[PDB]
Design a protein around this ligand. Structure first.
Ligand SMILES: [Hg+2]
Ligand SMILES: [Hg+2]
Lengths: 114, 119
């Protein structure tokens, strides 16, 4: 059926503040139905995979599910970015671990920073 | 002693970065070796992921006689790095999975990425 702002949110499993947030950023479109629910879960899911608000708008451009080549591309690009970020964080984790190890085994941290 | 440009060269960083560091007040119109050492301190820390605030705290311990307190900042940072990696890893796993299914889609079936984003 059609639904009020509060029931919409309940059906979509999200805060009312989040529905409003999504409306102001224009990731949506009185009352609401199942397409709206599905649309909100679309956004929330994508957001959770690390897509930016902009990237999600592009992704929604392809919502009718007949542009697979273009969809993969957004995901593959995001994946590339994720992997770079992980490779950087990994480089930090390695050195930080190494510094701590030397801290406990004694200031080497400061020494190494200089 | 050294000019803005040579300072940066000696410190192995952009001029924009020296200025950046001055405006945020992590520094000490000439410059010398303490300034160089101080900039390498910041740049290094920044490269290990320390925030500008965390670096100010870390600089409080610059004389190298507060090992307990230093480790703590590093250990806390290390925890945060690992969390972030664990989150990114979660994304990477599902995204990889979606792409794999994108490339593998059969005939005229609807886009799995979108499908998964709606289910
Ligand atoms: Hg796809
Ligand atoms: Hg230490």
């Amino acid at each position: 059926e059609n639904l009020t702002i509060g029931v919409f949110a309940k059906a979509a499993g999200v805060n009312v503040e989040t529905i409003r947030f999504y409306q102001r950023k224009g990731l949506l479109l009185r009352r609401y139905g199942e397409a709206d629910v599905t649309r909100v879960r679309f956004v929330k899911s994508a957001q959770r995979l690390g897509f930016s608000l902009d990237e999600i708008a592009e992704l929604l451009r392809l919502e009718d599910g007949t542009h697979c080549e273009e969809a993969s591309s957004l995901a593959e690009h995001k994946l590339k970015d994720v992997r770079e970020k992980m490779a950087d964080l990994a480089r930090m984790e390695a050195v930080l671990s190494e510094l701590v190890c030397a801290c406990h085994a004694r200031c080497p941290l400061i020494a190494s920073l200089q």
